Structures are given as structure tokens and as C-alpha cells.
Design a protein around this ligand. Structure first.
Ligand SMILES: NC(=O)c1ccc[n+]([C@@H]2O[C@H](COP(=O)([O-])OP(=O)(O)OC[C@H]3O[C@@H](n4cnc5c(N)ncnc54)[C@H](OP(=O)(O)O)[C@@H]3O)[C@@H](O)[C@H]2O)c1
Ligand SMILES: CC1=C(CC(=O)O)c2cc(F)ccc2/C1=C\c1ccc([S@](C)=O)cc1
Length: 316
């Protein structure tokens, strides 16, 4: 057994997920080893994406742990994400199918619209013209969503949701004429320096689960994250709580999200830290402790993805 939350489509999501994105100079071979270790350690939820260029490796890890008897498919919750070169409705299903072919899995547990800004179709994930300008596309995300809905009806994705959607964009889905399935989740950046209280409350009001990414304060990889940004795990309140509980500031940050009703992801490729992260289920924080962490909030967004800024659907 393991701790899960019931989603608004009746499916269940394990409340601690393993993040698999790593910076491009980390060999992709490391994702295979990391995901096996995560499963060994007790992660039952794995988070990936077409754009991470690791599905072949993450799929092999998963297949390997099923084929060797360590786990059944039904006790792995695997997430993929639809990349912005395949937002046009007729391209959605084929993108899910290529992900599944690369994974050698029959279905994904969850399939997300990765990012609301669309780019031109084709093999290149960031297509650019000869002058280096990103080739943006104009796509109605309500039509993208209908195509997602069909992928759920075909059984290829058990559940569907979104990522990096703001209030306006969620409403655009929620208020869609003929809407068949709400998003089960909105995966977004969330941590004690950016606690997303406002959007969290909105999502709760609509029974959408907020899935927190960069919950340990991000990979901090340039140029995507401003190296001047404060180091979350160096926070003195988190480090003092850690010290007090004989845990680590990472565990404190992760426990904070579980108690506030958020599903939390944690990436690590390091064997010790992978094992340590499942200890989030071994301790609890008091109301006073929780309030102290709410106090750390400071409007710090680490991951702007501002290479996609300009178009109206840029969410930040
Ligand atoms: N939907 C989206 O657009 C989106 C955006 C960003 C991320 N994500 C997903 O969310 C996942 C997590 O976000 P993310 O990678 O920014 O990083 P994140 O989990 O905040 O973690 C960042 C850093 O924490 C380190 N770490 C892990 N456990 C630790 C521990 N116990 N003590 C000290 N350090 C620890 C990792 O290094 P080691 O590997 O060496 O441990 C990693 O570099 C990604 O892999 C991806 O699946 C999705
Ligand atoms: C959407 C996305 C994210 C968020 C995530 O982890 O889900 C991400 C995070 C990073 F630190 C760097 C890139 C990405 C990214 C997509 C992406 C963009 C350009 C490239 S390069 C120019 O080919 C590769 C990937």
C-alpha cells in the first residue's frame, strides 16, 4: 500500500512523484538508473514528458521493474506531457502514440498539456526560423482539450490534466461548451518561496489537484533559472525545522506540500537522496510549523520559461 489522492475522474494519484528531467549534459543513461532506484525506494508515481527526451530510458526502467516482479503496472502511475509542437487537435493523439511507442507502454496514467504556448508542428521541439526566432503557432487550446478528452475515451490516457495554466486558462477549459472532462490536475511550480496559495485555493474549489514542481527549489540550471535567485534549501527556517526533526530541508519542503493537500514531485538522480525523499511519510509538521513555512512566501518564481513570452497564452 501507499498514499494516493482520488482525482476528479475517480482515478487515484500517488501523492509523491519522481521527477525525471535532468540538464542536457547529464547523459540520458542516468534516467534509466534513477527511475529503477525510485521504484525500489517506493515511488509509485513517475513524471516525464516528450520534451525531456528520456522516455525511452524511463520506459525501459518501468518495463524492467514490471518484468522482474518488483512491481505491477497498476502500481505505477506514469505521467507524460504533450509538447507544444503538437497542440493542433489532429496531432494530439499521434504525439501520445509516439510517447507510448518510445516507452513501450500501452497507456499513460496521466497526460498533460505541458505548456499553454503553441509552437509550429514538426520534429523540432523548439522550432526556430533562420534568425533564431521561435516559430509560434496559433491554436485554440479548447480544441486541444477535446483531442485530449478523446485520448482518455480511447484508453490511451487514464486521466488528463494541464500544466503551467493560470486562472484565466483553466477557466477557459472549465467553461468550455460541451466540456466532457475537467483537468484532473494543474502541474505548476510550488515551494515555500512561491506557495501558490491563491491558485491552490482556486484549484481546490474546482477539485483540481495542484501538482508541485521545483518543490525543492529547482535544478537551478542556467539559462532557465536566474542564478541570483535565493537557494530554497539554504533557508534558515527550513534548516532549523530540519535540524529540529532530524530530517533535511528537502524533506521539510516536501512534507509542507503534502499537508496542504498538494501532490509533490521531487527529482533526484542520487541514490541516497532518492531513498531519503520517501521519508516524507515518516513524520508530520505541527500547525505552528506549517504557519512558519507559509511565512517564507516571497513571490519568487524560478522557472519563467520566458523564451515563450509574447503570445497571449503565456501564463505568467
Ligand atoms: N510541468 C513542467 O513544466 C515542469 C517544470 C519543471 C519541472 N517539472 C517536473 O518536476 C520535477 C521536479 O522539478 P525540478 O527538477 O525543478 O527540481 P526539484 O525537485 O526542485 O529538485 C531540484 C534539486 O534537488 C536536488 N535534491 C533532490 N533531493 C534532495 C535532497 N533530499 N536533499 C538535497 N537536494 C535534493 C536534486 O539533485 P540530485 O539529483 O543530485 O539529488 C535537484 O537538482 C522535474 O524533474 C520534472 O519531472 C515539470
Ligand atoms: C517545458 C520545459 C521545462 C519545464 C519542465 O521541466 O517540464 C524545462 C525546464 C528547463 F530547465 C529547461 C527546459 C525546459 C522545458 C522545455 C524545453 C525547452 C527548450 C529545450 S532546448 C532549447 O532543446 C528543451 C526543453
Amino acid at each position: 500500500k501507499y498514499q494516493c489522492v482520488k482525482l476528479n475522474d475517480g482515478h487515484f494519484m500517488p501523492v509523491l512523484g519522481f521527477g525525471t528531467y535532468a540538464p542536457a549534459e547529464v547523459p540520458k543513461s542516468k534516467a534509466l538508473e534513477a527511475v529503477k532506484l525510485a521504484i525500489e525506494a517506493g515511488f509509485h508515481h513517475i513524471d516525464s514528458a516528450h520534451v525531456y527526451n528520456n522516455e525511452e530510458q524511463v520506459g525501459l526502467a518501468i518495463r524492467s521493474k514490471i518484468a522482474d516482479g518488483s512491481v505491477k503496472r497498476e502500481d505505477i502511475f506514469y505521467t507524460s506531457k504533450l509538447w507544444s509542437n503538437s497542440h493542433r487537435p489532429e496531432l494530439v493523439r499521434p504525439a501520445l502514440e509516439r510517447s507510448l511507442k518510445n516507452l513501450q507502454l500501452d497507456y499513460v496514467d496521466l497526460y498533460l498539456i505541458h505548456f499553454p504556448v503553441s509552437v509550429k508542428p514538426g520534429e523540432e521541439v523548439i522550432p526556430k526560423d533562420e534568425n533564431g526566432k521561435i516559430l509560434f503557432d496559433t491554436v485554440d487550446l479548447c480544441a486541444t482539450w477535446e483531442a485530449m478528452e478523446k485520448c482518455k475515451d480511447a484508453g490511451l490516457a487514464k486521466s488528463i490534466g494541464v500544466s503551467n495554466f493560470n486562472h484565466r486558462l483553466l477557466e477557459m477549459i472549465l467553461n468550455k461548451p460541451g466540456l466532457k472532462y475537467k483537468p484532473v490536475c494543474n502541474q505548476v511550480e510550488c515551494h515555500p518561496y512561491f506557495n501558490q496559495r491563491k491558485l491552490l485555493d482556486f484549484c481546490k474549489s474546482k477539485d483540481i489537484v495542484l501538482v508541485a514542481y521545483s518543490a525543492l527549489g529547482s535544478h537551478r540550471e542556467e539559462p532557465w533559472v536566474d542564478p541570483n535567485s535565493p537557494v530554497l534549501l539554504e533557508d534558515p527556517v527550513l534548516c532549523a525545522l530540519a535540524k529540529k526533526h532530524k530530517r533535511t530541508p528537502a524533506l521539510i519542503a516536501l512534507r509542507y506540500q503534502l499537508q496542504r493537500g498538494v501532490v509533490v514531485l521531487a527529482k533526484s538522480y542520487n541514490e541516497q537522496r532518492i531513498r531519503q525523499n520517501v521519508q516524507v511519510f515518516e513524520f508530520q509538521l505541527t500547525s505552528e510549523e506549517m504557519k512558519a513555512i507559509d511565512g517564507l512566501n516571497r513571490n519568487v518564481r524560478y522557472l519563467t520559461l520566458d523564451i515563450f513570452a509574447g503570445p497571449p497564452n503565456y501564463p505568467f
